[PDB]
Amino acid sequence: MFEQFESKFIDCDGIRTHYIEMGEGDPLVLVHGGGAGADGRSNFADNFPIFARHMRVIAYDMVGFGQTDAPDPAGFAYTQAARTDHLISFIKALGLSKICLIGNAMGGTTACGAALKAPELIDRLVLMGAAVNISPDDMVANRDDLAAVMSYDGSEEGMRKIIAALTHSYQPTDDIVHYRHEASLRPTTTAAYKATMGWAKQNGLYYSPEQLASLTMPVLVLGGKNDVMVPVRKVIDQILAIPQAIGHVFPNCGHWVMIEYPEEFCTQTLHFFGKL
Amino acid sequence: MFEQFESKFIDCDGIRTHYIEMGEGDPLVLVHGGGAGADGRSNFADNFPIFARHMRVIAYDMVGFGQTDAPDPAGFAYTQAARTDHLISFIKALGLSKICLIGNAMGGTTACGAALKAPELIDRLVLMGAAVNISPDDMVANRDDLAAVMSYDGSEEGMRKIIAALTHSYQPTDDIVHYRHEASLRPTTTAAYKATMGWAKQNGLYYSPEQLASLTMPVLVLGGKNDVMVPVRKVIDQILAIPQAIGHVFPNCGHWVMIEYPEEFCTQTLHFFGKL
Ligand SMILES: O=C(O)/C(O)=C(Cl)\C=C\C(=O)c1ccccc1
Ligand SMILES: O=C(O)/C(O)=C(Cl)\C=C\C(=O)c1ccccc1
Ligand code: NA
Ligand code: NA
């Protein structure tokens, strides 16, 4: 699946990093989320052709995901700082700067991380259902609401349940269900996954109210009102914790805005980037 | 001021009602707020030419304001129900239906009122810093924050303070300051004003969580993050109380979105109306 895009690879301080790109002009990096088997092209396939009419759009796989190197976790700590520094390395590897940057969930954590640590690389930031204020205790409120995502049996019909929990009325095609099922069991990245989630659950995915107020570039914050994973109240907190932030909340919408409303996701973000 | 628009008048069940219109096509009604001396053209002059490129845009003066009849309050109760029924009468007077409808503050109260009572007239609703959940007790939290708006001396330099409280960084021209000063002392509408605000302060400007969930058409909810009059937390509550509602929060922005960011106000609402 997804062979419409050409896989490319670049070295990021020793991490061989998979990415796809399309379009010309100003750079937009997309950062995928941290679900089991997530990567750039499955998170963003729908939006890529829209963005590519206006910008050079780029999705990469975070360390531990996709076809990017997953360093053995017997020797590599899968911490947030590890993702952030990888993103920064990736950006610099391609030579870009003053990018537009969008992150979903743990990808949001990472985009925010980079915007904090290397602000000179990032002109605009979009946080979408972003894990930027989820505490260790917030992890562990395993509501009924995560029945499917937490007790994932490893089966196809299990993956359908996870997709149906993470979205409001979206109905994935068989090939998407198949691709997400498989990717979720890939040997290469299962270990890295269990480490990534272990660390997250223990340490949360979190920046301080003061860190958040210190972002130096324009910010757009998006969220699905029905998002069962990064609840709308946390997306509101982020809108109120980040002074300059624009806030946009989508109704009848779960955690996958870019997928559930591709058009509207692309319109609002392109408008914020000054391409409409 | 504002002679670029032609004053028109129509009878609404015995209330002679001032309105201006511009443009052609699908109807958009704008409902002004309830500040002292408010009316259609001072609230909306900046947006009118933008909207008029795409729609037939219409701003009217609510009963008690502007050049609309202000029935003597020795004989007329200036209740919310009175504004709502006037709006409904106005809409029907012009023969429209399936309108797009935008209300600011008490105008929001009134637009919401109409959308509840006569849903067949309204296809889309925008609530902007809308007074749709402000209780009697909420009125009376006279924070330091309303120093200027509550202790308004009746002077020009007093009006500058009110404008500077209601906005984030907006700098009104002398003519706007003069026009708002004068309109705030117009004999015809001062009495109606003191009655309107007396009733509001006593009864609040309020619909129930259940009323709000019962709106039957698409809803867009907007607010300024720095709005000192209808605080961002109440605009968020409305976004969460109205299931289908889209929510959009503007940063560096007070209560007058349409005035402080005319372009962005017009873009987001026209997009929601399906004209972009
Ligand atoms: O958007 C996706 O890629 C996705 O389907 C999921 Cl389940 C993402 C989850 C997180 O990033 C996450 C991890 C731990 C806590 C909260 C969110
Ligand atoms: O937007 C305007 O026309 C304006 O400048 C003001 Cl001060 C409006 C105030 C209300 O509608 C209102 C009245 C009572 C309580 C809350 C808001
Ligand atoms: Na669902
Ligand atoms: Na101000």
Smallest CA–CA separation between B249 and chain A, in Å? 5
* Dihedral, CA of residue A42, residue A31, residue A191 and residue A201, to nearest 10: -120
DSSP string, A29-77: EEE---STT--HHHHHTTTHHHHHTTSEEEEE--TTSTTS----TTT--
Structure tokens at B125: 């609703």
C-beta atoms surrounding B151 within 10 Å: 11
Q: Are B63 and B86 in contact (CB under 8 A)?
A: yes
Per the listing, tokens 């109120």 go with: A240
Ligand 2 pocket test target in B62, B104, B238, B265 with most atoms within 8 Å of CB: B104
CA of A43 from ligand 3 middle (Å) equals 17
Q: Beta strands A15-22 and A8-12: pairing type?
A: antiparallel
Smallest CA–CA separation between B240 and chain A, in Å? 8
Our CA angle for B220, A166, B245, nearest 5°, is 10
Q: How was this structure determined?
A: X-ray
Which range of residues forms the domain containing residue B209? 1-276
Smallest CA–CA separation between A30 and chain B, in Å? 23
C-beta atoms surrounding A135 within 10 Å: 12
Structure tokens at B56: 């037939």
Cα distance between residue B257 and residue B167, in whole Å: 8
Give break positions in chain B: residue before each, C–N beyond 2.5 Å.
none
Ligand nearest to the CA of B228: 4
Helices (H), chain B: 40-44, 48-52, 80-93, 106-117, 147-150, 156-166, 174-183, 187-203, 209-213, 232-241, 257-260, 262-273
N- to C-terminal Cα separation, chain A: 31
Q: What is the CATH number of the domain that holds A197?
A: 3.40.50.1820
C-beta atoms surrounding A182 within 10 Å: 13
Query: How many interface pairs between A and B have CB atoms less than 8 angstroms apart?
Result: 37
When divided into structural domains, chain A yields a total of 1
Per the listing, tokens 């300059």 go with: A244
- A38: which residues sit within 8 A by CB, 6+ positions away? A32, A65, A66, A183
C-beta atoms surrounding A8 within 10 Å: 13
| β partners of residue A27 | A56
Residues in chain B with CB shorter than 8 Å from the CB of A245 are: 251
With a 6 A CB cut-off, is B124 part of the ligand 2 pocket? Answer: no
Q: Are B132 and B158 in contact (CB under 8 A)?
A: no
With a 6 A CB cut-off, is A126 part of the ligand 1 pocket? Answer: no
Structure tokens at A139: 């992890």
Residues in chain A with CB shorter than 8 Å from the CB of B232 are: 240
Cα distance between residue A167 and residue A129, in whole Å: 12
Give the resolution in Å: 2.0
Q: Are B135 and B209 in contact (CB under 8 A)?
A: no
Q: Which of A207, A237, A52 is nearest to A135 (CA)?
A: A207
Ligand nearest to the CA of A131: 1
CA of B34 from ligand 2 middle (Å) equals 4
For helices A174-183 and A156-166, the axis angle rounded to 10 degrees is: 100
Cα distance between residue A4 and residue A20, in whole Å: 10
Cα distance between residue A243 and residue A212, in whole Å: 9
Which among A243, A245, A249 has CB closest to B247? A249
CA of A105 from ligand 1 middle (Å) equals 5
DSSP A16: E
B239–A225 CB contact, under 8 Å: yes
With a 6 A CB cut-off, is A229 part of the ligand 1 pocket? Answer: yes
Query: Whose CA is closest to atom 5 on ligand 1?
Result: A35
- Environment class of residue A132 by beta-carbon count within 10 Å: exposed (0-12), middle (13-18) or buried (19+)? buried
Q: Beta strands B122-128 and B219-224: pairing type?
A: parallel
Ligand 2 atom closest to residue B36's alpha carbon, by position in its atom list: 7
Ligand nearest to the CA of A228: 3
Per the listing, tokens 């008490």 go with: B106
CA of B12 from ligand 1 middle (Å) equals 55
- A20: which residues sit within 8 A by CB, 6+ positions away? A5, A6, A7, A8, A40, A41, A48, A58, A59
Cα distance between residue B30 and residue B175, in whole Å: 23
